[PDB]
Design a protein around this ligand. Structure first.
Ligand SMILES: *[C@H](O)[C@H](C[C@@H]1CCNC1=O)NC(=O)[C@H](CC(C)C)NC(=O)OC[C@@H]1CCC(=O)N1CCc1ccccc1
Lengths: 306, 306
């Protein structure tokens, strides 16, 4: 029996119309053109043989408006004249003389651990694929990014409003990925320098494991549900010692509890038991806990509720 | 011997000139006036009788520009006419007919656990005090806020640029505080609703304990330094077992290591030993580890390095 869950991304057309190529010096990558602004990673300014220890303040000083070449290849091609340049954290903010006529309604937001967002993977200003990821508790994502992908963007959507939350910057030693928010901060404690960096431990996202167990119940799979319960406070004490995030309930989780008649505290108890082993059984085709589906994913994909 | 460390805030004058009072119906709090925008917490729209589960989308639709009353009290008083209103996350963005003539150079940024920022505490649009806090690992601050303080702002400063990072929203059960970033997200998993919320465990901020031990050494207090070392990898495994954040070194910590001649790993070992007990001894007047001073504080206040 199939769960009815897939890795679901937003439709990407609105964001496709905002992608451009940015070239500076010897480097090229992707940028995001919104209104009269093009956003891109600041390491486009770095000579390839200095990415280990750049002085970004000095690099920026050394640039003029004409140092940046901005090209839209998709749809109606365009070359955008840069009339101002600025740095915000790890991003460049290039002002251009033409407002993107396809700018969608949008905001900038930061994504939190356990939350899902959609990525539009781009190369040379050309979108090539889309996928969805969950921000991990150690502020990496398990993405799929190759050389030239920097400046690819991640986003959520509320109604018709695109909430941009991620701009790709780098790949870590363990194959995971991280990037910037559009306030210019890197996620987590990472820095946009080409050096090996301390990686924090990952954890299971407890809220998402609960959502997945609710998805199992919604599919008729509930052998792991017992009358036994673990309080949220007791679970969160246990989580600290056992590689789980602390559980914080939400209206989305509550909706799943009401629809199934299974209390959150029953599933917190179940998680504690399942973490010691599934004992030969499967849940939705898995023998390990799944934390890559959110409560919102389960509500939307199984119940049609947004 | 006094360490030379105090809790140091930025001079507040530039931010004082941006504070206003925002009133909606019978609710009032503070806002931040930059250019033609006033930022404030969206719960100013909520009747005191409905704060437990507000329908903020419906509340926003019910408002008109005339629903909001904005006054500047400090300096040259002004009554500011609202000409547009919108909501971003947990903040309102009110457009006013006058641009703040004292708008400083500014950006919006998010602050990370362990980082310090300055707070300007305001009541009824009038600044009353300033203090500094570190963002705790559980995304609370140990502040000093009473009824009417919402909309008080926190910020850092780089050169002449004010980086706004915090707008005050709420007090938690244990007396700590939290708020929003100016992308409208609440810090942590918190929600701007008047209901009990799960409080995540706090942790010691390792990078700041290291800074404080370097401050001790700079002041001639180094009895806890041994040849013994703990690697960053080993310490971080220990940290997860002992309620400490994982350590991620920075250029600022590195400068302290060079100035004192003591390696980070020697202090990581010392922390492990001191956490089991100071053995009746004191460090900079303390019998417990201190994590409220950053590496930058130590560099700036003791060595004069910004
Ligand atoms: C805004 O000025 C004000 C600032 C508060 C007031 C006291 N000190 C502060 O820092 N903020 C609010 O009034 C909040 C409004 C929400 C965001 C809609 N509410 C708030 O801070 O409530 C605090 C109280 C006391 C401690 C606590 O837990 N709560 C929430 C309600 C509660 C739930 C369960 C158990 C006990 C209390």
């Amino acid at each position: 029996h199939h769960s009815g869950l897939v890795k679901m991304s937003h439709p990407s057309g609105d964001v496709e119309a905002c992608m451009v190529q940015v070239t500076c010096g010897s480097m090229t990558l992707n940028g995001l053109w919104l209104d009269n602004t093009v956003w891109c990673p600041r390491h486009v300014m770095c000579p390839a043989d200095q990415l280990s220890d750049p002085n970004y303040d000095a690099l920026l000083i050394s640039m003029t408006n004409h140092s940046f070449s901005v090209q839209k290849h998709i749809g109606a091609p365009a070359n955008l004249r840069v009339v101002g340049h600025a740095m915000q954290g790890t991003l460049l903010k290039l002002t251009v003389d033409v407002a993107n006529p396809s700018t969608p309604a949008y905001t900038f937001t930061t994504v939190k651990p356990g939350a899902a967002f959609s990525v539009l993977a781009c190369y040379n200003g050309r979108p090539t694929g889309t996928f969805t990821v969950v921000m991990r508790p150690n502020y990496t994502i398990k993405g799929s990014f190759l050389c030239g992908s920097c400046g690819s963007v991640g986003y959520t959507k509320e109604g018709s409003v695109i909430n941009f939350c991620y701009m790709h910057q780098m790949e870590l030693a363990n194959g995971t990925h991280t990037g910037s928010a559009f306030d210019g901060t890197m996620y987590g404690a990472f820095m946009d320098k080409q050096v090996h960096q301390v990686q924090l431990t990952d954890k299971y996202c407890s809220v998402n494991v609960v959502a997945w167990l609710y998805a199992a119940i919604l599919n008729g799979c509930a052998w792991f549900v017992k009358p036994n319960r673990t309080s949220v406070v007791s679970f969160n004490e246990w989580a600290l010692a056992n590689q789980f995030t602390e559980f914080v309930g939400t209206q989305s989780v509550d909706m799943l509890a009401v629809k199934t008649g299974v209390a959150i505290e029953q599933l917190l108890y179940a998680i504690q038991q399942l973490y010691t082993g599934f004992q030969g059984k499967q849940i939705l085709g898995s023998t390990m806990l799944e934390d890559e589906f959110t409560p919102e994913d389960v509500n939307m994909q199984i119940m049609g509720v947004v």
